[PDB]
């Protein structure tokens, strides 16, 4: 039973593979749905079962995802490295199904449910540290995630308490535990594997990707910089869907693009006389000037720990991928010193 768009039709209480009993729907996307199940072959443990649509290209994509997930499990037998656990996978009549550990809301959905009020700095610290650990493990194992964003980082448990923010005169939802996992390995790429030309969701996309200079592990670090900023202020760093505007936003926030990258890119339509072809005195240019500013201007406190966070973000947003902070270096940053 498939619907017109290729989704599996199910009802609460259905069993799949005489094993997975459907309890509720956790979420839905273009690729399929994730459903909460009781796994009766695992002592009744609750799992998140991803049911991919009956679509040949999605099926093929899921097989690659499964291979990355299998590599993760293999290299992490004690489940230490903060990437989601796949417990099982099967082909269910064309629908690829992947059984995952059951987690809570994504960091995006939690942020959204909290009216986009940012995470406090001590939570940003722990969340950022875990994000760096999880992706370092990937990078250590010749993998690049390529699609890191707040939607793909879930809280292990998103139970919260109401806290009052005196500065903002509002109630805030405060997650009880900041434990997180990186999910969605559908785009993850091994060093030796065919690389897609364009990767990452627009807002999180590295300049070497936009400029088609080649990409590898460092493009994840750029995304991470963008994510950490979004946790701290609550809005996306690069709110644009246009390459040239995106590049102009980078220049306003971070300063001019290095000449070597400009010289090397085939994307010469974006450039004039060796610099970005952007007129700040147009309305397009006015928009960028009014809707973003130099990176450090986003600090909400002059206290040292806030400056330390921005030191880290700034290093992660180094234009040159070979000069960019590696995650091994990031884990040693002074910003993380306050963490246990
Ligand atoms: O892809 C994975 O690796 C992946 C792995 C695990 C979960 C997931 C995606 N998505 C969840 N929720 C969710 C929320 C919104 C939309 C959609 Cl489709 C799914 C979810 C919830 C609870 N526990 C584990 C997961």
Curated annotation (Swiss-Prot):
GO terms for molecular function: ATP binding; identical protein binding; protein serine kinase activity; protein serine/threonine kinase activity; protein serine/threonine/tyrosine kinase activity; protein tyrosine kinase activity. Residues 20-336 form the Protein kinase domain. Autophosphorylates on all three types of residues. Phosphorylation plays a critical role in cell proliferation following low dose radiation and prevents cell death following high dose radiation. Phosphorylation at Thr-201 by PKB/AKT2 induces its kinase activity which is required for its stability. Keywords: ATP-binding, Kinase, Nucleotide-binding, Nucleus, Phosphoprotein, Serine/threonine-protein kinase, Transferase, Tyrosine-protein kinase. The active site is at 147 (proton acceptor). Endothelial cells. Expressed in androgen-dependent prostate cancer cells. It comes from Homo sapiens. GO terms for biological process: negative regulation of gluconeogenesis; protein autophosphorylation; protein phosphorylation; regulation of RNA splicing; response to ionizing radiation. Interacts with RBMX. Interacts with AKT1 and UBL5. This is Dual specificity protein kinase CLK2. Dual specificity kinase acting on both serine/threonine and tyrosine-containing substrates. Phosphorylates serine- and arginine-rich (SR) proteins of the spliceosomal complex. May be a constituent of a network of regulatory mechanisms that enable SR proteins to control RNA splicing and can cause redistribution of SR proteins from speckles to a diffuse nucleoplasmic distribution. Acts as a suppressor of hepatic gluconeogenesis and glucose output by repressing PPARGC1A transcriptional activity on gluconeogenic genes via its phosphorylation. ATP binds at residues 26-34, 50. Its main location: nucleus. The modification Phosphothreonine is found at residue 201. The chain holds residues 144 to 483 of 499 of the full protein. GO terms for cellular component: nuclear body; nuclear speck; nucleoplasm; nucleus. The modification Phosphotyrosine is found at residue 10. Belongs to the protein kinase superfamily. CMGC Ser/Thr protein kinase family. Lammer subfamily. The gene is CLK2. It is an enzyme of class 2 (transferase).
């Amino acid at each position: 039973e498939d619907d017109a768009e290729g989704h599996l039709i199910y009802h609460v209480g259905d069993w799949l593979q005489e094993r997975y009993e459907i309890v509720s729907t956790l979420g839905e996307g273009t690729f399929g749905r994730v459903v909460q199940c009781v796994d009766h072959r695992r002592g009744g443990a609750r799992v998140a079962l991803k049911i991919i649509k009956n679509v040949e290209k999605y099926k093929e994509a899921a097989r690659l995802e499964i291979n990355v997930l299998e590599k993760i499990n293999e290299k992490d037998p004690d489940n230490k490295n903060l990437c989601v656990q796949m417990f099982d996978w099967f082909d269910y009549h064309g629908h690829m199904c992947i059984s995952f550990e059951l987690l809570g809301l994504s960091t995006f959905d939690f942020l959204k449910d909290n009216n986009y009020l940012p995470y406090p700095i001590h939570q940003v610290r722990h969340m950022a540290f875990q994000l760096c650990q999880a992706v370092k493990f990937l990078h250590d194992n010749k993998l690049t995630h390529t699609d890191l964003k707040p939607e793909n980082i879930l809280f292990v448990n998103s139970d919260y308490e109401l806290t009052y923010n005196l500065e903002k005169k509002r109630d805030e939802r405060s997650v009880k535990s900041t434990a997180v996992r990186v999910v969605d390995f559908g785009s993850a790429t091994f060093d030796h594997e065919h690389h897609s030309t364009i990767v990452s969701t627009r807002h999180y996309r590295a300049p070497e990707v936009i400029l088609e200079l080649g990409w590898s592990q460092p493009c994840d670090v750029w995304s991470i910089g963008c994510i950490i900023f979004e946790y701290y202020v609550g809005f996306t760093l690069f709110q644009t869907h246009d390459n040239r505007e995106h590049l102009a936003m980078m220049e306003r926030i971070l300063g001019p693009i290095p000449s070597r990258m400009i010289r090397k890119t085939r994307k010469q339509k974006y450039f004039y006389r060796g610099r970005l072809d952007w007129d700040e005195n147009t309305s397009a240019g006015r928009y960028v000037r009014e809707n973003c500013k130099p990176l450090r201007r986003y600090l909400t406190s002059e206290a040292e720990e806030h400056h330390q966070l921005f030191d880290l973000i700034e290093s992660m947003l180094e234009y040159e991928p070979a000069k960019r902070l590696t995650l091994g270096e990031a884990l040693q940053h002074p910003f993380f010193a306050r963490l246990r």
